Amino acid sequence: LRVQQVSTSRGMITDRSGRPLAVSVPVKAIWADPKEVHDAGGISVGDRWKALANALNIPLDQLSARINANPKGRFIYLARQVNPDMADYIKKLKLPGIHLREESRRYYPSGEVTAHLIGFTNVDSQGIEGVEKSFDKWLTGQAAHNLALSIDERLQALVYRELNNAVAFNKAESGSAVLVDVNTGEVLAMANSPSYNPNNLSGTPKEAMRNRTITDVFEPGSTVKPMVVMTALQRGVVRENSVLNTIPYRINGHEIKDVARYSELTLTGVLQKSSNVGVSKLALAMPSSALVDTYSRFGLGKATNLGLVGERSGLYPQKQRWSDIERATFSFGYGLMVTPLQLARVYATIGSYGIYRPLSITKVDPPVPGERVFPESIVRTVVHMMESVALPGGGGVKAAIKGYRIAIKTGTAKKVGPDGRYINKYIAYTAGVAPASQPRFALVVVINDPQAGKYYGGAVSAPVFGAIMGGVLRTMNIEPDALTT
Ligand SMILES: *C(=O)[C@@H](NC(=O)/C(=N\O[C@@H](COc1ccc(C(=N)N[C@@H]2CCCNC2)cc1)C(=O)O)c1csc(N)n1)C(C)(C)NOS(=O)(=O)O
Numbered sequence: 001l002r003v004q005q006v007s008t009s010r011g012m013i014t015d016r017s018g019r020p021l022a023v024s025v026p027v028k029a030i031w032a033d034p035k036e037v038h039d040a041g042g043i044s045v046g047d048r049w050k051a052l053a054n055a056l057n058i059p060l061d062q063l064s065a066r067i068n069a070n071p072k073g074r075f076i077y078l079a080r081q082v083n084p085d086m087a088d089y090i091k092k093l094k095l096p097g098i099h100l101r102e103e104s105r106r107y108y109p110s111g112e113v114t115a116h117l118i119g120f121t122n123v124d125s126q127g128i129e130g131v132e133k134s135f136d137k138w139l140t141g142q143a144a145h146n147l148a149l150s151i152d153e154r155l156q157a158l159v160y161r162e163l164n165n166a167v168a169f170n171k172a173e174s175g176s177a178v179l180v181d182v183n184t185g186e187v188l189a190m191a192n193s194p195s196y197n198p199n200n201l202s203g204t205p206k207e208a209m210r211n212r213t214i215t216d217v218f219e220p221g222s223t224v225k226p227m228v229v230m231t232a233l234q235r236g237v238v239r240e241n242s243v244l245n246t247i248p249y250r251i252n253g254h255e256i257k258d259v260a261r262y263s264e265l266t267l268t269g270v271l272q273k274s275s276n277v278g279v280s281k282l283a284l285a286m287p288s289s290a291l292v293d294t295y296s297r298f299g300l301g302k303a304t305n306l307g308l309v310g311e312r313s314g315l316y317p318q319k320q321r322w323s324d325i326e327r328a329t330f331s332f333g334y335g336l337m338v339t340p341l342q343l344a345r346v347y348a349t350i351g352s353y354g355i356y357r358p359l360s361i362t363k364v365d366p367p368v369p370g371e372r373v374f375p376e377s378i379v380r381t382v383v384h385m386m387e388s389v390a391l392p393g394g395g396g397v398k399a400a401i402k403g404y405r406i407a408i409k410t411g412t413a414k415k416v417g418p419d420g421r422y423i424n425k426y427i428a429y430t431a432g433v434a435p436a437s438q439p440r441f442a443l444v445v446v447i448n449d450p451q452a453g454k455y456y457g458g459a460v461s462a463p464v465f466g467a468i469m470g471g472v473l474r475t476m477n478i479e480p481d482a483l484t485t
Pocket of ligand 1: 219220221222223259273274275276332333334395409410411412413414415416456457458
């Protein structure tokens, strides 16, 4: 006869290098056998029995009422996480029913730096959120196992240090950032702000406990424009040397206007100035299924398959009929909703020059055989085109790193509101790859609703990119690609 459901230790979570991210700490817990007292021990008062309740700081009247609450049970928790020096005194009191049992509570050395991804456990050491829940059966002993994540705590800590201070400085509602290795699909960083300290889950609002990298969905905005140009090159609408007439016009009665008045722009200049008129005239010159297909090939609308709780696949339009105004707006954001993790996998394919690799939060044994979803030559051309964004004249010139070549694309989305209409709050986007000569990392920096002054990604989310991606290349010892080194 067994009256105990779980009575064993649990595993340990580390990063890809072996640094502790989630360690079990052994703690003693006082329990009692209520059937032992009533059947043969006999419920008594006075003696040292009263001092036993006086040591637990529980009144002897109600402590005796909790054990006597059921004369048939064989287990009852008197206290939790008792220290050894005082628990050894309770065992030395020789109680005819009280026993000691070695349990374990969790400690996370990263703390709030990896909180949304690591997660936590309940008082009985059962995973609830994040990696703790997704790999509970693996970590739980009954068959104890360890686990090594794909996160690099060196890069993870520097992404949080800049993303957390960016949300605070701009007084933004939220802020997410995802870093993924280009040619392996391994998630290196995954930070959110504001966060919580999983070592103490007291008064932490559940609104700040959601993994916004996989939960929040937003219209990607201008960040999908590289795929608009990449599709326009394969469909033969234009060539790399084409010049588009970017004069504002009206599709289906609604005005299509750029950020500024540009009479004509280069194909490279469209991604530079983020011309909605340029991408709209390209989308209208193609079948509507072209952009719907290419977006899917890069992972949009598809599941990320990480196994994390609350992981959304985003809203993706499957319409069979498209209005000309809906085809044009679909080129620069309107129409679909994707998580920051899905947007990172898009640029994880852009960096791979058209290779779609699955996302994994565990250390992968190389090599990772992906699947070529787009011609390598076209992506190489557009990736070099995206470098103009981080050069004088582009939108993400504030994201430029001193001594490196990067290819990025800024964005600014209008938040759809509670009643379905667009609000005056914006989503600042900045996503790109680096090094531009040989891509190795893909980064996405998205912050929710800036209120400090500016709101577009090129002025709010872009300087976060250059500060983060700057530290990523220094830590990984990547050779500079700048003309002036
Ligand atoms: C790309 O996503 C695209 N934005 C949109 O199409 C969407 N909304 O656009 C809103 C306007 O956003 C902006 C307005 C003005 C500026 C700006 N002042 N630019 C600076 C001028 C000075 C020199 N540096 C540049 C920036 C953004 C709106 O319509 O109110 C949209 C798409 S999907 C969705 N839900 N909303 C642009 C505006 C091209 N991205 O611009 S950005 O600079 O790359 O961030």
